[PDB]
Amino acid sequence: SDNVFLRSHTKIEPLIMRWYAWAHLVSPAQHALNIAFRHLPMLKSFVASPAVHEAASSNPEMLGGPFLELKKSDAAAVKALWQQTQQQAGRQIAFAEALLELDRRLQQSETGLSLDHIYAELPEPLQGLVEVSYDLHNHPSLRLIEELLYLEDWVDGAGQEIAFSLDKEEERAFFMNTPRVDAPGRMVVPLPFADARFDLLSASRLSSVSFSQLADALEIPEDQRPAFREYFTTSAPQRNEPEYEGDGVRVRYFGHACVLVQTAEVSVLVDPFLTWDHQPEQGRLTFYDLPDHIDYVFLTHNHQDHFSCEALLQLRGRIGHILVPRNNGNNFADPSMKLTLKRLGFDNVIVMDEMADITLPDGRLVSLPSYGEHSDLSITSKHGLYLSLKGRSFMFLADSDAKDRVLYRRIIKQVGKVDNLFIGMECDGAPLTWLYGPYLSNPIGRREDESRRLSGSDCERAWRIVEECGCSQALVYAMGQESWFRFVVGLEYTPDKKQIVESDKFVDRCRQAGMAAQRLHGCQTMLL
């Protein structure tokens, strides 16, 4: 009689070689580029002077910078992981080094003549995996045949683990800064993400599971099992109205860019990033407050604050279809989100082109074109969402930057007028290299780096969408102001920050036009 649930606040943190698993560590090409040109430099730089990294991590303004949030005591662990990563990922570092070295060579040497000679001189890690081509101006680009790369022998479950923890989410270290080294209260269990055993682990969130059977499946030493039992409880988790049986449309804003739309017949989840800590003063909606079945999960783009492998892995058997955008195969920074999801065990993945629609009970959903927020890189894995359910029209644009009002004019011509606009106002994002640094074979200038930021719409540009779509309500979302997103989004915005000032300008101009408008802060359940 060992039927146990996961404790409601037990966090299942997925780790790839102790680094928090975000999308680019799951796709192999970007993972190799991140091991060799992000993780190894930060780990080696930490070993040389741990004091340097605490000093940068102490200054809260540069919270996301390339420095570990670890302390001098963890020096032994960092150096060990740095050496472990050298031997474990030897094929990865050879691929990343060979891939970038090829890319530098082509820029210098290929000027418009035939590229047939290149395939003869391809290094072994790239042989049969890369196609060399030109644009219409004799600039070479490297196109990875990702489907063949995913079947390479070094694309395995090695390094994939899970970190059980009971600490509050505000305690999480930054996802790209800090590896999850061994710590008290943190129990790391080796487990491939696509493994069936994970499905048994995800079942214990909402359904009772035998503890000994689960601990046996999870290869848990019996000496460590008393400590592993701490993450489990006999009581079932409390859930705040997961289902909805009204004839209307219920929208639940779960924080940042996570918003669930629900009729009594369909559920649509946009950019799932959830919390497992309940805290009533903030009136949180948690992972448990989601319905048992989510018909459609919509992934706007491939950023860590909209693509949470932690949330998706525990929601695997509960998701009818994941809706993703198409990727640009000719760009290293744009891996296919299907495949990345396939490696996480997801085959219910629909790649949607622009203006592609799916018919839903009492309505439809359309994948909309989106511009920007990717440092002006030819990344195409971005799309907005038009949602129609029982007469109510919704448009979620996430961090899309409305550079061209005529684009949304053309969009409204097909999908019609929208009732509720969800727009993100992160208009001062990180520079290019903060995210796409390890993928650059040749470094970029600081003026170029600071001009192309991960920035969305400001007040003026967001007003273009409102004018074109004629919404009665405009909701500013995807601001990252809730507490449990600090470890992914960064600092909470003080009222003087441009993102808060511009957002305040936008809500005011909307109300001046006679619409309902607000900046979402804290979780909210709305009926409409």
Binding residues for ligand [O] (CB under 6 A): 373, 399, 426, 429-430, 454, 456
In whole angstroms, the minimum distance from the beta carbon of 448 to ligand [O] comes to: 17
Q: Which of 441, 472, 524, 525 binds a copy of itself (CB under 8 A)?
A: 441
Q: Which of 75, 94, 264, 377 binds a copy of itself (CB under 8 A)?
A: 377
| Residue 386 near residue 394 (C-beta atoms within 8 A) | yes
Residue 333 engages a copy of itself in binding (rule: CB under 8 A): yes
Question: How far apart are alpha carbons 165 and 329 in whole angstroms?
Answer: 37
Is 305 labeled as ligand-binding? yes
Judged by CB under 8 A, the chain residues 86 through 125 that form the site for a copy of itself are 103, 107, 112-116, 119, 122
Query: Based on CB atoms, which residue is closest to a copy of itself, 31 or 464?
Result: 464
Token pair in block for residue 502: 């511009």
Q: Which stretch binds a copy of itself (CB under 8 A): 80-88, 159-167, 177-185, 448-456?
A: 448-456
In whole angstroms, the minimum distance from the beta carbon of 378 to ligand [O] comes to: 18
Give all strands (DSSP E) within 113-173, no chain letters: 130-134, 140-144, 160-165
Question: How far apart are alpha carbons 255 and 399 in whole angstroms?
Answer: 14
In whole angstroms, the minimum distance from the beta carbon of 301 to Fe ion comes to: 5
Looking at the chain, after which residues does the C atom sit over 2.5 Å from the next written N, breaking the chain? none
Token pair in block for residue 399: 């961090």
Query: Based on CB atoms, which residue is closest to a copy of itself, 38 or 284?
Result: 38
Query: Based on CB atoms, which residue is closest to Fe ion, 74 or 458?
Result: 458
Give, in order, the Cα–Cα distances in Å from 182 to each of 369, 375, 486.
43, 35, 22
Residue 47 engages a copy of itself in binding (rule: CB under 8 A): no
| Residue 445 near residue 432 (C-beta atoms within 8 A) | no
Residue 358 engages a copy of itself in binding (rule: CB under 8 A): no
Burial of 395-412, coded b for 16+ CB within 10 Å and e otherwise, reads bbbbbbbbeeeebbeebb
Is 399 labeled as ligand-binding? yes
Question: How far apart are alpha carbons 347 and 257 in whole angstroms?
Answer: 24
Query: Based on CB atoms, which residue is closest to a copy of itself, 147 or 170?
Result: 147
Q: Which stretch binds a copy of itself (CB under 8 A): 29-37, 206-214, 309-317, 438-446?
A: 438-446
Query: Based on CB atoms, which residue is closest to ligand [O], 303 or 464?
Result: 303
Question: How far apart are alpha carbons 506 and 131 in whole angstroms?
Answer: 46
Give, in order, the Cα–Cα distances in Å from 40 to each of 11, 85, 98, 373, 442.
27, 8, 16, 27, 18
Among a copy of itself, ligand [O], Fe ion, none, partner that 429 touches (CB below 5 to 8 angstroms by kind): ligand [O]
Among a copy of itself, ligand [O], Fe ion, none, partner that 501 touches (CB below 5 to 8 angstroms by kind): none
Among a copy of itself, ligand [O], Fe ion, none, partner that 55 touches (CB below 5 to 8 angstroms by kind): none
Query: Based on CB atoms, which residue is closest to a copy of itself, 263 or 380?
Result: 380
Q: What is the contact surface with Fe ion in residues (CB under 5 A)?
A: 303, 305, 373, 399, 478
Query: Based on CB atoms, which residue is closest to a copy of itself, 413 or 495?
Result: 413
In whole angstroms, the minimum distance from the beta carbon of 327 to a copy of itself comes to: 10
Q: Which of 403, 417, 497, 511 binds a copy of itself (CB under 8 A)?
A: 403
Query: Based on CB atoms, which residue is closest to Fe ion, 341 or 379?
Result: 379
Question: How far apart are alpha carbons 85 and 102 in whole angstroms?
Answer: 23
Q: Which of 49, 83, 127, 224 binds a copy of itself (CB under 8 A)?
A: 127
| Residue 390 near residue 247 (C-beta atoms within 8 A) | yes
Q: For strands 349-352 and 319-325, give the pairing.
A: parallel
**Angular region, 55: left φ>0, alpha ψ -120 to 50, beta rest:** alpha
Residue 414 engages a copy of itself in binding (rule: CB under 8 A): yes
In whole angstroms, the minimum distance from the beta carbon of 42 to Fe ion comes to: 22
Query: Strand, helix or coil at 3?
Result: strand
Q: Residue 308 carries which side chain, given as an amino acid letter?
A: S
Residue 97: how many CA atoms within 13 Å on its side-chain side? 9
Question: How far apart are alpha carbons 307 and 22 in whole angstroms?
Answer: 7
Token pair in block for residue 273: 């990033």
Question: How far apart are alpha carbons 124 and 116 in whole angstroms?
Answer: 17
Give residue 143's Cα distance to chain centre.
23
Is 373 labeled as ligand-binding? yes
Residues recorded for the chain = 528
In whole angstroms, the minimum distance from the beta carbon of 450 to ligand [O] comes to: 13
Among ligand [O], Fe ion, a copy of itself, none, partner that 135 touches (CB below 5 to 8 angstroms by kind): a copy of itself
Question: How far apart are alpha carbons 92 and 30 in whole angstroms?
Answer: 10
Q: Which of 452, 459, 471, 484 binds a copy of itself (CB under 8 A)?
A: 452
Is 303 labeled as ligand-binding? yes
Question: How far apart are alpha carbons 250 and 258 in whole angstroms?
Answer: 14
Residue 408 engages a copy of itself in binding (rule: CB under 8 A): yes
Token pair in block for residue 457: 């719409």
* Residues touching a copy of itself, count (CB under 8 A): 72
Query: Based on CB atoms, which residue is closest to ligand [O], 154 or 434?
Result: 434
In whole angstroms, the minimum distance from the beta carbon of 151 to Fe ion comes to: 27
Nearest one of 101, 98, 96 to 37, comparing CA atoms: 96
Q: For strands 232-233 and 250-255, give the pairing.
A: unpaired
In whole angstroms, the minimum distance from the beta carbon of 467 to a copy of itself comes to: 14
In whole angstroms, the minimum distance from the beta carbon of 138 to a copy of itself comes to: 7
Binding site, by residue number, is 301, 303, 305-306, 373, 399
Binding site for Fe(3+), by residue number, is 301, 303, 305-306, 373, 399
